[PDB]
Symmetry: C3
């Protein structure tokens, strides 16, 4: 029959308002405030956390403050292991109320909520990002959110910790928690290597032209939303590749210029004309490597016929010292994918190459280059096949 | 007086939490999951639907599963007619509770909710997209959401069906249901016809240059959000025009290049100089044709002085074989409008035309062309006059 | 201990569902409908307002309609003063219920809600944009929203009024109230002054080339979201500068062309070659002037090392009459900042300048220029340092 949830005679239940809050959170779970480690109250038998608020699949969880320590987690028996400190909801448990709403003594022992240590495979099997209490096909009764990597040493020592920032709704994303900017950078200058195909380093280090003969590796300002993307964990690809953490339709914006651009000089033999040199800037996705996503999670497989390379800018050098470009595209990206940008040109400097024979500031380079990568759409349901291949 | 809705002494009512959920849905109604046709349980007297959840102006509606058929709709008396299967809320009806919250026997016969067949004019007069239960000026008591076009044949046959995808929040738009991408495509190549003004086909078929003498009509990947736009229903305009289904401020992104671009060759007579040829890429809106929107709904009239054409790219060919371009603009668009892109240049190939005299790959063409159209703002209230004219 | 807010045994309270609605409003407070001044029912002793709905930090407030006047505010004692008409929540007050939910006589005198006159410093000390009832560090019990500037004259006269549009969620922003477009314009043409550095007027008046010898100040269509930005209040900077009203990561899109672009003519002395002229289009932020934000509010100080200028387009003129450009960047902006766009080139017209020696349509100018400024991210928490410097 046709059931009303929110109507005059309806009883509005707890799964109901939690389903509403989840919708209001754009189906994102995470710590809204606090819940960071309290090292001062952390011993070799206990792990302390500060007060705060989290939302886990629409269920509001609070660590209350008083007097500190705001909360204590038992670390007895944990040694020489890397574990995940998790906030878990277990709907098989019973919340025990006591006292009364008549006197001012009503309290609940929320046994459905736990702060616990899990290993990586156990967390993954019940991770909120892959499984749901509200799921249609495979509904779960137990769901977790990892807060910290906790590395326990020998018996009698305090452990080492690393915050799981993808699970904290810290800042930059309030209002649109599941979307917004994935990555962005300030303008940078990057020397073009004398090769046909090369990646443009988008992870905060560029090969900056500094003199007429030299370039040097130089940091530039970059930001990444850890919920959406991360720098590649393999050092070979760390300067260039992002790992996508969340499926979706993403917008890629690029702008900059090609400085000291090569071209065939106008001479009597070519009827005093500039001989343009072809170049292209491409964005690329690659999913050949599995388990690149956070916790080594299984990648989300793309639909059959998915794109791998897309031309953002494709043209010839125009005979000017510096030529600007700009491009905006929407592209599908999948959890576990690598994403990168490439500069492509010919290798014959006297015939087809956009680059010259110089080095540093005397050599062809990208100048004032910047990008923004933003999540603008999801790939749930039918969108996976209809929108996911490009 | 000043009334509190959510305060300590307030009674939080059913219209209240439904007004809250509607706000949380960005004022969009639609099926959240399931509610698709069940052909196996569909006869000549009954129409079956699978279980699911919908939100209609903040009211949560559920079709419950058990044992199937999840729900049955009486089709007796319906023959040789095209009807709309609708989910309707009727606040004039009474929801009948039975049993008690003390025993575990509390139930409700939700007479305020109906699954019914309506003709197009009846649905339009009570369509959620144009009328509201929460409306300020004209509050309604009955509101509907169309789910399927149902075409009944002769008495004794099962009917034909077509899903109304604009009313299903399927995928791509979760989190931002009333906004996001309206249309997008992968890069395509399109031959420039030897005319002053022509539309660029944005609907999935381009005239692709394939040889030195020929081009051929070729499909390219395209996606449209049916809630925001649709391909023009008239075959004359189907390759080029979109029909806007929702008022708003939209962002249009375009990028690509003009390949085999024409220019006056540098000769002794012109002092060995390239004679550039002017071209422009424009986006256009046209509202002369009424009833192009879904169901033949009345178009939303634009404010006095509304734009019709906007230059995205306006420049000269630079003497290169291929020249890239990019542009981003925000534009106002109205339900019922046609939206299209045009390429504009002179017609004299030896004087003012950006195109040459060649055909296929030897002729001037758009290369690596793509676009994204996205809804970024609404046109409610004062914005209609202040933001709606451009 | 671990407390559940939304669980089976939880009591869902009034601060709770107000915290939920605030989250659903993207932490924006404002009038959702009505609440505009009623001049017909306004005397020298009373100020009338029409019915409507507002949300103040998740608390729903309603002015009920009946018979009008929908509400009356006592103006006795107010004279020769500019005041702010404010809607205030005071949690120190007691809401007085009467009657019963058994009979149909339950009513509340909401003493926690006031419509009052405050001076600018008092409103600022309890303004919802800077302080919160739900605040972590400094929780408040009293919070206000300014609705109108009210200027009272001599005793016996009706006052003058000006709506505070930043506090009305009127239109353009429903669905994403705290984000969306900040400013946008239609295409305009603007004469380039014969100077090294100049601002591009983004506030609705351009110096339009009209003849071969003259340009004239001409209005063009522009829109600003008053919640996000405003035209500079100082006349010296009014044609060019925006004042940012809300911290965040903003997206700036620009497009247009440089028409009648200057270049060194190809002659036998330069081997029949175009001598390109460097130019750049930059966006800029400046926070040297305090109190530019609405009500003269204190500016939000940017993190150490914040950017001030960013190149959007940097290249040489290519020897064409008209050359197009486009650029998209994300930038951090702070409440109280000035934001503007600049055109930068050399001043020697025979050597390094992108501009020529002509005037009006015979002189170098921006053609088909437009922009969109959009709020795309916040700068709360860690994002302030990680994302706020660029
Ligand atoms: C299995 C493996 O290491 N594959 C890598 C892939 O991860 C990476 O994205 C790509 C970059 O060009 O190179 C290889 O394909
Ligand atoms: C009444 C009618 O058919 N008008 C059409 C309009 O629908 C369409 O948008 C336009 C395309 O250029 O051509 C005409 O104006
Ligand atoms: C204190 C003062 O008036 N400073 C102004 C600043 O407000 C403005 O943004 C800038 C524009 O270039 O000029 C000055 O710096
Ligand atoms: C041919 C090519 O693209 N080579 C890239 C190189 O530019 C990049 O620096 C390196 C690390 O990402 O990976 C290679 O695959
Ligand atoms: C002069 C002009 O713009 N002609 C267009 C044509 O390019 C387009 O293919 C056709 C169908 O959309 O409609 C015409 O109006
Ligand atoms: C050198 C420079 O940038 N001058 C600008 C000028 O172009 C602008 O018209 C005026 C008002 O905004 O402010 C000046 O600072
Ligand atoms: Zn649910
Ligand atoms: Zn996953
Ligand atoms: Zn956006
Ligand atoms: Zn309502
Ligand atoms: Zn309509
Ligand atoms: Zn709160
Ligand atoms: Zn402030």
């Amino acid at each position: 029959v046709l059931k009303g949830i929110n109507f005059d005679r309806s009883i509005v239940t707890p799964e109901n308002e939690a389903s509403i809050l989840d919708l209001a959170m754009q189906n994102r779970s995470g710590v809204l405030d606090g819940m960071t480690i309290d090292i001062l109250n952390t011993t070799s038998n206990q792990l302390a956390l500060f007060h705060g608020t989290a939302v886990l699949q629409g269920y509001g969880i609070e660590i209350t403050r008083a007097a500190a320590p705001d909360v204590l987690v038992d670390t007895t028996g944990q040694s020489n292991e890397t574990m995940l400190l998790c906030l878990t909801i277990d709907l098989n448990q019973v919340n025990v109320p006591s006292g009364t709403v008549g006197t001012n003594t009503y309290a609940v022992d929320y046994k459905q909520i736990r702060l616990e240590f899990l290993d990586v495979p156990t967390l993954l099997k019940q991770y909120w990002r892959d499984h749901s209490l509200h799921d249609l096909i495979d509904p779960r009764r137990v769901i977790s959110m990892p807060l910290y990597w906790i590395t326990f040493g020998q018996t009698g020592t305090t452990p080492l910790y690393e915050q799981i920032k993808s699970n904290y709704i810290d800042g930059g994303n309030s209002g649109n928690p599941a979307y917004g900017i994935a990555a962005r950078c300030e303008n940078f200058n990057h020397f073009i290597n004398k090769v046909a195909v090369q990646s443009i380093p988008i992870n905060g280090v560029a090969n900056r032209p500094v003199s007429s003969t030299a370039s040097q590796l130089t940091n530039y300002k970059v930001w990444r939303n850890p919920y959406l993307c991360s720098q590649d964990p393999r050092d070979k690809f760390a300067p260039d590749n992002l790992v996508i953490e969340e499926d979706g339709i993403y917008r890629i914006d690029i702008s900059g210029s090609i400085n000291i651009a090569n071209y065939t000089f106008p001479a009597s033999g070519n009827s005093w004309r500039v001989g343009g040199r072809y170049f292209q800037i491409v964005c690329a996705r690659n999913s050949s490597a599995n388990n690149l996503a956070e916790f080594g999670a299984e990648q989300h497989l793309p639909p059959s016929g998915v794109w791998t390379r897309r031309v953002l800018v494709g043209e010839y050098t125009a005979g000017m010292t510096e030529q600007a470009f700009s491009s905006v595209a929407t592209i599908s990206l999948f959890k576990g994918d690598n994403f990168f940008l490439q500069f492509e040109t010919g290798t014959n400097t006297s015939r087809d190459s956009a680059y010259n024979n110089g080095y540093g500031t005397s050599g062809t380079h990208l100048r004032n280059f910047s990008y923004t990568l933003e999540r603008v759409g999801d790939l749930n349901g039918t969108a996976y096949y209809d929108n996911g291949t490009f």
